[PDB]
Design a protein around this ligand. Structure first.
Ligand SMILES: [Ca+2]
Ligand SMILES: [Ca+2]
Ligand SMILES: [Ca+2]
Ligand SMILES: [Ca+2]
Ligand SMILES: [Ca+2]
Ligand SMILES: [Ca+2]
Ligand SMILES: [Ca+2]
Ligand SMILES: [Ca+2]
Ligand SMILES: [Ca+2]
Ligand SMILES: [Ca+2]
Ligand SMILES: [Ca+2]
Length: 258
Protein backbone atom coordinates (compact mmCIF):
# COMPACT_ATOMS: atom_id res chain seq x y z
CA UNK A 1 0.00 0.00 0.00
CA UNK A 2 1.99 2.96 -1.34
CA UNK A 3 -0.50 5.74 -0.54
CA UNK A 4 -1.93 4.04 2.58
CA UNK A 5 -5.62 4.04 1.59
CA UNK A 6 -6.19 0.36 2.35
CA UNK A 7 -6.27 -0.67 -1.31
CA UNK A 8 -3.28 -2.80 -2.48
CA UNK A 9 -0.82 -1.27 -4.96
CA UNK A 10 -1.52 -3.71 -7.80
CA UNK A 11 -5.28 -3.13 -7.55
CA UNK A 12 -5.06 0.64 -7.01
CA UNK A 13 -6.27 2.49 -10.12
CA UNK A 14 -4.63 5.59 -8.65
CA UNK A 15 -1.71 4.22 -6.58
CA UNK A 16 -0.29 7.69 -5.90
CA UNK A 17 -3.49 9.18 -4.47
CA UNK A 18 -5.18 8.00 -1.25
CA UNK A 19 -8.71 7.11 -2.35
CA UNK A 20 -11.62 4.81 -1.61
CA UNK A 21 -12.32 1.11 -2.20
CA UNK A 22 -15.52 1.70 -4.19
CA UNK A 23 -13.53 3.35 -6.99
CA UNK A 24 -10.45 1.10 -6.96
CA UNK A 25 -8.35 3.29 -4.67
CA UNK A 26 -9.37 6.57 -6.32
CA UNK A 27 -10.68 9.63 -4.41
CA UNK A 28 -14.18 11.14 -4.53
CA UNK A 29 -13.44 14.74 -3.50
CA UNK A 30 -16.96 16.23 -3.46
CA UNK A 31 -18.52 12.97 -2.28
CA UNK A 32 -21.11 12.79 -5.07
CA UNK A 33 -20.35 9.16 -5.94
CA UNK A 34 -18.37 9.97 -9.08
CA UNK A 35 -14.57 9.74 -8.68
CA UNK A 36 -12.43 12.78 -9.60
CA UNK A 37 -11.01 11.20 -12.76
CA UNK A 38 -14.57 10.88 -14.11
CA UNK A 39 -16.17 13.90 -12.40
CA UNK A 40 -16.44 16.85 -14.78
CA UNK A 41 -17.15 19.03 -11.73
CA UNK A 42 -14.93 17.32 -9.11
CA UNK A 43 -15.55 19.87 -6.35
CA UNK A 44 -19.30 20.28 -6.89
CA UNK A 45 -21.98 17.62 -6.24
CA UNK A 46 -23.86 16.49 -9.34
CA UNK A 47 -25.72 13.50 -10.84
CA UNK A 48 -24.17 10.81 -13.04
CA UNK A 49 -26.40 12.13 -15.84
CA UNK A 50 -23.98 15.03 -16.27
CA UNK A 51 -20.86 13.27 -15.04
CA UNK A 52 -21.03 14.80 -11.58
CA UNK A 53 -22.03 18.27 -12.75
CA UNK A 54 -25.15 19.90 -11.27
CA UNK A 55 -28.04 21.13 -13.41
CA UNK A 56 -29.27 23.96 -11.19
CA UNK A 57 -32.23 25.23 -13.23
CA UNK A 58 -33.15 21.72 -14.35
CA UNK A 59 -33.21 22.28 -18.11
CA UNK A 60 -31.11 19.18 -18.76
CA UNK A 61 -28.02 21.25 -19.42
CA UNK A 62 -25.43 21.25 -16.61
CA UNK A 63 -24.31 24.64 -15.30
CA UNK A 64 -20.84 24.24 -16.86
CA UNK A 65 -22.41 24.12 -20.32
CA UNK A 66 -25.50 26.28 -19.62
CA UNK A 67 -25.09 29.77 -21.11
CA UNK A 68 -27.83 30.83 -18.69
CA UNK A 69 -27.29 28.43 -15.76
CA UNK A 70 -30.00 29.98 -13.58
CA UNK A 71 -32.84 30.14 -16.13
CA UNK A 72 -34.30 27.10 -17.93
CA UNK A 73 -33.76 27.19 -21.69
CA UNK A 74 -33.77 24.87 -24.73
CA UNK A 75 -30.59 23.19 -25.99
CA UNK A 76 -31.05 25.14 -29.23
CA UNK A 77 -29.77 28.21 -27.40
CA UNK A 78 -27.39 26.40 -25.03
CA UNK A 79 -29.67 26.65 -22.01
CA UNK A 80 -30.92 30.16 -22.75
CA UNK A 81 -34.72 30.61 -22.96
CA UNK A 82 -36.62 31.97 -25.95
CA UNK A 83 -39.84 32.62 -24.05
CA UNK A 84 -41.95 34.20 -26.83
CA UNK A 85 -40.41 31.94 -29.47
CA UNK A 86 -39.31 34.66 -31.90
CA UNK A 87 -35.90 32.98 -32.19
CA UNK A 88 -34.28 35.61 -30.00
CA UNK A 89 -33.24 34.55 -26.46
CA UNK A 90 -34.68 36.66 -23.62
CA UNK A 91 -31.21 38.02 -22.82
CA UNK A 92 -30.99 39.56 -26.30
CA UNK A 93 -34.73 40.14 -26.80
CA UNK A 94 -35.74 43.74 -26.09
CA UNK A 95 -39.31 42.50 -25.62
CA UNK A 96 -38.79 38.97 -24.22
CA UNK A 97 -42.51 38.33 -23.75
CA UNK A 98 -43.76 39.48 -27.17
CA UNK A 99 -42.50 38.01 -30.45
CA UNK A 100 -40.94 40.56 -32.79
CA UNK A 101 -38.55 41.07 -35.76
CA UNK A 102 -34.79 40.88 -35.19
CA UNK A 103 -34.21 44.30 -36.76
CA UNK A 104 -36.32 45.94 -34.06
CA UNK A 105 -34.39 44.07 -31.39
CA UNK A 106 -37.01 41.55 -30.39
CA UNK A 107 -39.95 43.91 -30.08
CA UNK A 108 -42.81 44.34 -32.54
CA UNK A 109 -42.68 47.59 -34.53
CA UNK A 110 -44.49 50.18 -32.37
CA UNK A 111 -47.46 52.35 -33.41
CA UNK A 112 -47.44 55.29 -31.01
CA UNK A 113 -50.43 57.38 -32.14
CA UNK A 114 -52.33 54.19 -33.01
CA UNK A 115 -53.43 55.12 -36.54
CA UNK A 116 -52.36 51.69 -37.81
CA UNK A 117 -49.30 53.09 -39.59
CA UNK A 118 -46.11 51.83 -37.93
CA UNK A 119 -43.71 54.46 -36.51
CA UNK A 120 -41.07 53.57 -39.10
CA UNK A 121 -43.68 54.17 -41.81
CA UNK A 122 -45.56 57.03 -40.13
CA UNK A 123 -44.56 60.39 -41.61
CA UNK A 124 -46.29 61.95 -38.60
CA UNK A 125 -45.60 59.39 -35.81
CA UNK A 126 -47.24 61.50 -33.08
CA UNK A 127 -50.46 62.54 -34.85
CA UNK A 128 -53.19 60.18 -36.08
CA UNK A 129 -53.61 60.16 -39.86
CA UNK A 130 -54.86 57.88 -42.67
CA UNK A 131 -52.39 55.51 -44.34
CA UNK A 132 -53.14 57.07 -47.74
CA UNK A 133 -51.29 60.11 -46.40
CA UNK A 134 -48.45 58.10 -44.84
CA UNK A 135 -49.92 58.46 -41.37
CA UNK A 136 -50.25 62.24 -41.57
CA UNK A 137 -53.58 63.92 -40.76
CA UNK A 138 -55.40 65.89 -43.44
CA UNK A 139 -58.58 67.99 -43.17
CA UNK A 140 -61.86 66.09 -43.57
CA UNK A 141 -64.94 67.39 -45.41
CA UNK A 142 -66.29 69.55 -42.58
CA UNK A 143 -62.93 71.09 -41.71
CA UNK A 144 -62.26 71.93 -45.36
CA UNK A 145 -65.57 73.82 -45.26
CA UNK A 146 -64.46 75.42 -42.00
CA UNK A 147 -61.20 76.50 -43.64
CA UNK A 148 -63.05 78.03 -46.59
CA UNK A 149 -65.38 79.79 -44.14
CA UNK A 150 -62.32 81.62 -42.83
CA UNK A 151 -61.08 82.37 -46.35
CA UNK A 152 -64.44 83.92 -47.23
CA UNK A 153 -63.72 86.60 -44.61
CA UNK A 154 -60.50 87.72 -46.34
CA UNK A 155 -61.25 91.22 -47.59
CA UNK A 156 -59.52 93.24 -50.31
CA UNK A 157 -59.68 96.88 -51.33
CA UNK A 158 -62.30 97.43 -54.06
CA UNK A 159 -60.87 96.58 -57.48
CA UNK A 160 -57.47 95.92 -55.92
CA UNK A 161 -55.54 92.91 -54.62
CA UNK A 162 -54.36 94.58 -51.41
CA UNK A 163 -55.48 92.73 -48.28
CA UNK A 164 -57.32 94.99 -45.84
CA UNK A 165 -55.76 95.24 -42.38
CA UNK A 166 -58.89 94.06 -40.55
CA UNK A 167 -58.63 90.57 -42.06
CA UNK A 168 -55.15 90.01 -40.63
CA UNK A 169 -56.77 88.25 -37.69
CA UNK A 170 -58.64 85.66 -39.75
CA UNK A 171 -55.52 85.11 -41.87
CA UNK A 172 -53.42 84.12 -38.85
CA UNK A 173 -56.24 81.78 -37.89
CA UNK A 174 -55.89 80.33 -41.39
CA UNK A 175 -52.11 80.05 -40.93
CA UNK A 176 -52.50 78.05 -37.71
CA UNK A 177 -54.90 75.67 -39.47
CA UNK A 178 -52.36 75.12 -42.24
CA UNK A 179 -49.55 74.73 -39.69
CA UNK A 180 -51.66 71.88 -38.29
CA UNK A 181 -51.09 70.12 -41.63
CA UNK A 182 -47.35 70.53 -42.38
CA UNK A 183 -47.17 67.78 -45.02
CA UNK A 184 -50.26 68.81 -46.99
CA UNK A 185 -50.26 71.17 -49.97
CA UNK A 186 -52.95 73.79 -50.57
CA UNK A 187 -54.35 75.66 -53.56
CA UNK A 188 -55.16 79.32 -52.87
CA UNK A 189 -58.07 80.24 -55.15
CA UNK A 190 -59.36 83.67 -56.17
CA UNK A 191 -63.00 83.86 -57.26
CA UNK A 192 -65.17 86.70 -58.59
CA UNK A 193 -68.73 86.95 -59.90
CA UNK A 194 -69.67 87.22 -63.59
CA UNK A 195 -70.24 90.98 -63.35
CA UNK A 196 -68.04 93.14 -65.57
CA UNK A 197 -65.09 92.11 -67.71
CA UNK A 198 -64.05 88.47 -67.26
CA UNK A 199 -60.52 89.24 -68.47
CA UNK A 200 -60.04 91.82 -65.73
CA UNK A 201 -61.50 89.46 -63.13
CA UNK A 202 -59.08 86.69 -64.09
CA UNK A 203 -56.14 89.05 -63.48
CA UNK A 204 -57.69 90.45 -60.29
CA UNK A 205 -58.49 87.05 -58.77
CA UNK A 206 -54.97 85.82 -59.61
CA UNK A 207 -53.45 88.90 -58.01
CA UNK A 208 -55.63 88.34 -54.93
CA UNK A 209 -54.70 84.65 -54.71
CA UNK A 210 -51.04 85.64 -55.07
CA UNK A 211 -51.54 88.18 -52.27
CA UNK A 212 -52.95 85.58 -49.87
CA UNK A 213 -50.15 83.14 -50.69
CA UNK A 214 -47.61 85.89 -49.92
CA UNK A 215 -49.24 86.51 -46.53
CA UNK A 216 -49.19 82.81 -45.59
CA UNK A 217 -45.52 82.46 -46.59
CA UNK A 218 -44.51 85.35 -44.30
CA UNK A 219 -46.64 83.70 -41.62
CA UNK A 220 -44.49 80.57 -41.67
CA UNK A 221 -46.03 78.38 -44.39
CA UNK A 222 -43.47 77.02 -46.89
CA UNK A 223 -43.85 78.52 -50.37
CA UNK A 224 -43.55 75.11 -52.02
CA UNK A 225 -46.67 73.93 -50.19
CA UNK A 226 -48.86 76.61 -51.75
CA UNK A 227 -50.34 77.14 -55.20
CA UNK A 228 -52.11 80.38 -56.18
CA UNK A 229 -54.75 80.38 -58.91
CA UNK A 230 -57.19 83.01 -60.17
CA UNK A 231 -60.50 81.54 -61.33
CA UNK A 232 -62.47 84.69 -62.10
CA UNK A 233 -66.14 83.71 -62.49
CA UNK A 234 -65.22 80.23 -63.75
CA UNK A 235 -66.36 78.35 -60.63
CA UNK A 236 -69.57 79.77 -59.11
CA UNK A 237 -71.16 78.25 -56.02
CA UNK A 238 -74.29 80.38 -56.35
CA UNK A 239 -76.38 82.06 -59.05
CA UNK A 240 -75.05 85.26 -60.63
CA UNK A 241 -78.56 86.55 -61.41
CA UNK A 242 -79.03 88.17 -57.99
CA UNK A 243 -77.03 90.15 -55.43
CA UNK A 244 -76.84 87.56 -52.64
CA UNK A 245 -75.63 84.95 -55.13
CA UNK A 246 -72.92 87.19 -56.57
CA UNK A 247 -71.71 88.00 -53.05
CA UNK A 248 -71.31 84.27 -52.42
CA UNK A 249 -69.33 83.89 -55.66
CA UNK A 250 -66.85 86.62 -54.68
CA UNK A 251 -64.50 84.65 -52.44
CA UNK A 252 -61.10 83.21 -51.72
CA UNK A 253 -60.85 79.46 -51.20
CA UNK A 254 -58.00 77.48 -49.66
CA UNK A 255 -58.42 73.89 -50.77
CA UNK A 256 -56.39 70.77 -50.01
CA UNK A 257 -54.48 69.49 -53.04
CA UNK A 258 -55.08 65.74 -53.27
CA1 LIG B 1 -3.27 2.18 -2.03
CA1 LIG C 1 -4.90 5.03 -4.28
CA1 LIG D 1 -17.19 13.28 -7.19
CA1 LIG E 1 -19.00 16.53 -9.01
CA1 LIG F 1 -29.31 23.91 -16.65
CA1 LIG G 1 -30.36 27.39 -18.44
CA1 LIG H 1 -37.65 35.74 -27.88
CA1 LIG I 1 -39.55 39.30 -28.30
CA1 LIG J 1 -48.85 55.55 -36.30
CA1 LIG K 1 -49.41 59.36 -37.64
CA1 LIG L 1 -53.84 75.15 -61.16
Amino acid sequence: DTDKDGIPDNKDACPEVPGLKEFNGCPDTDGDGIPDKDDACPQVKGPKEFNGCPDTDGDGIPDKDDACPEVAGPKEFNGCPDTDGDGIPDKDDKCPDVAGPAENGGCPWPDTDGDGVLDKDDLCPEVAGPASNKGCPEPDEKEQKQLNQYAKTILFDTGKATIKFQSAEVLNQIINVLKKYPNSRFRIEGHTDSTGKKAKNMILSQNRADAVKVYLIQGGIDAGRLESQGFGPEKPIASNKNKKGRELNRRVEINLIK
